[PDB]
Amino acid sequence: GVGISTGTFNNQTEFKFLENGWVYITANSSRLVHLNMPESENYRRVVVNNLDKTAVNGNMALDDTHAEIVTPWSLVDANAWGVWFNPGDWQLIVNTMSELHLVSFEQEIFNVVLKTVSESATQPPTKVYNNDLTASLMVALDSNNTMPFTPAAMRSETLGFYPWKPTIPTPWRYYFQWDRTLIPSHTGTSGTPTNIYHGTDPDDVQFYTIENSVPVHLLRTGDEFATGTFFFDCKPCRLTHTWQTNRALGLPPFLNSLPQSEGGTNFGYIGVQQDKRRGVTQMGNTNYITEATIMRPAEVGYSAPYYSFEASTQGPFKTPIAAGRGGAQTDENQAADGDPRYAFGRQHGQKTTTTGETPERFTYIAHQDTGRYPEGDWIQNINFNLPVTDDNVLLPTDPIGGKTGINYTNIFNTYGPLTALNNVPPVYPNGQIWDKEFDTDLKPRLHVNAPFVCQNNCPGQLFVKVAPNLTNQYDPDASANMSRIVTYSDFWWKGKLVFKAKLRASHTWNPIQQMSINVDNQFNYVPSNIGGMKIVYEKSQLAPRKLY
């Protein structure tokens, strides 16, 4: 009833160890959530069109043109690592365990409170907030996944990462179909290259509403709502990175001359003529058997186009890339390798004391060396007459299609039936945790936004919305918009995410990569003179593995 709580705050993370090193990580999370009434109780199809920026020529990549359905509903998305673990937790997981399975996920909503503003009372005149006991909070759980999947981690619009700091849901919205053509161009280009929003393919129209698809719960103060326990089914995510590229797969060539004094240029030598050597290559011509030549069982990683933009029905988009990291010391071509870049705000990691609308950012560079350094690419002629003539080799220097700033690697693609890959490493704390699978008849071998993909069925999205609190004058027949009592709600959310992981073991003489502090770094993990605070990017696949 009124004065009786209906839930329990728990943001506690339990690590329960079982036999043969299987661990049962139960991550609990709770937040106080704040929510205002919708800006209007109506669904809207709104179009965005920045001809102002796209008509610029050379500005094709800046297109924001799209269509959108704006709903009076808000989304409670908890899909982000930062919602579930603090650094202390993350340290434990990443340093001590080898893989990670996703087991179960449940959530509930409790201690609902609804208050009406209204306002105006009295002298200078100040505003006042009272309880509406009989008012309701609408909650709807789309467990059938009827509605478009909108993971909020992509827009850094998930729940807060701090337990003691309140948070908010995000206004729900989804893509509505639109046709669109935009021809690329450069600064030099004459005329106005065609740039139009043609409209909407009627055969492709889908207008969704919460009301017609999902059962809606009305919660007053004393009511509570809990979901079931959802059980996942996916592959394991691994917490070890592979370091080997093709150049280090298998049996190294025998050294007939070993160095006999320590030092930095005291190299060893194979000691056999490069053309008088034994082994297997895929070069039918020469008898040269060298490390860049000698056969390897397959190919680790692949080359991809960058920055490739492709275009379909609804406009242009970047061609996404899988692997990374690929370069040597401190130089990686963060685009040929498609290293992801995260932007986020105060609620999700940025220093909470920082004023101004500029977001904090970082680029995740993985530890797993499976990418490319296209500067080192080249292509020789069939004949392999070397030292090679300029006429017989194509370099990443030699311009393509007569452009000084373009070479073959920009359109290059070496994905093939010998390609080997890893799945994306987890990005703490801004990374997405799980993601729905495309309902295409054929599916991607992975996603770049999250390591766990539900081919089964994913948890339904959870939607909240303040119920219309009407005044006494209401005419629905009237064109003038609805006068509603100003109302808002505070409610508590508790979720439970269960993982099952396995402890790693030492198999090498040497120690290995592990997180810690650090006389540097040490200060990203405590509050400040004022109320803190900051959560920092921190990797995930620290311990080495082994491909082959």
Residue 545 in marked binding region: no
- Footprint of its own copies on 58-97 (CB under 8 A): 60-66, 68-70, 72, 86-92, 95
- Evaluate whether 137 touches 219 at the Cβ level (below 8 Å): yes
- Footprint of Mg ion on 348-407 (CB under 5 A): 369
- Evaluate whether 114 touches 195 at the Cβ level (below 8 Å): no
Size of site (CB under 5 A) for Mg ion: 1
Residue 204 in marked binding region: yes
Question: Of these, 18, 58, 119, 228, which contacts its own copies (CB under 8 A)?
Answer: 119
- Evaluate whether 88 touches 508 at the Cβ level (below 8 Å): no
Q: How far apart are CA 80 and CA 427, in angstroms?
A: 9
- Footprint of its own copies on 201-220 (CB under 8 A): 202-209, 211-220
Asked if 229 touches its own copies (CB under 8 A), the answer is no
Cβ neighbours around 519 below 10 Å, total:
6
Asked if 332 touches Mg ion (CB under 5 A), the answer is no
Asked if 148 touches its own copies (CB under 8 A), the answer is yes
Shortest gap between Cβ of 328 and Mg ion (angstroms)? 9
Shortest gap between Cβ of 230 and its own copies (angstroms)? 19
Shortest gap between Cβ of 426 and Mg ion (angstroms)? 17
Asked if 277 touches its own copies (CB under 8 A), the answer is yes
In the complex with its own copies, the residue whose CB is nearer, 319 or 380, is 319
Spatial CA neighbour of 128 closest among 143, 116, 141, 114: 116
Residue 296 in marked binding region: no
Q: Return contacts of 271-280, CB within 8 angstroms, 24+ apart.
A: 277/253, 279/253
In order, the DSSP letters of 293-336 are TB--SSEES----TT-EEEETTEEEEPP-------STT---TTT
Going by the DSSP 8-state scheme, the letter that residue 96 receives in this structure is H
φ/ψ (deg, to 5) at 96: -115, -15
Residue 477 in marked binding region: no
Asked if 515 touches its own copies (CB under 8 A), the answer is yes
In order, the DSSP letters of 468-526 are --B-S---TT-SSPPPB--EEEEEEEEEEEEEEEEE----SSS--------TTTGGGGS
361 binds, options its own copies, Mg ion, none, Cβ within 5 to 8 A by partner type: its own copies
Binding mask 6-45 for its own copies (x = CB under 8 A): -xxxxxxx-x-x------------x-x-x-x--xxxxxxx
52 φψ region: left (φ > 0), alpha (ψ -120 to 50), beta (else): alpha
357 binds, options its own copies, Mg ion, none, Cβ within 5 to 8 A by partner type: its own copies
Asked if 337 touches Mg ion (CB under 5 A), the answer is no
Interface segment toward its own copies; rule CB under 8 A; list 230-238, 240-248, 335-343, 369-377: 335-343
Asked if 526 touches its own copies (CB under 8 A), the answer is yes
Size of site (CB under 8 A) for its own copies: 245
Token representation of residue 172: 């729900």
- Evaluate whether 178 touches 197 at the Cβ level (below 8 Å): yes
- Residues at the annotated binding site? 201, 204, 325, 369
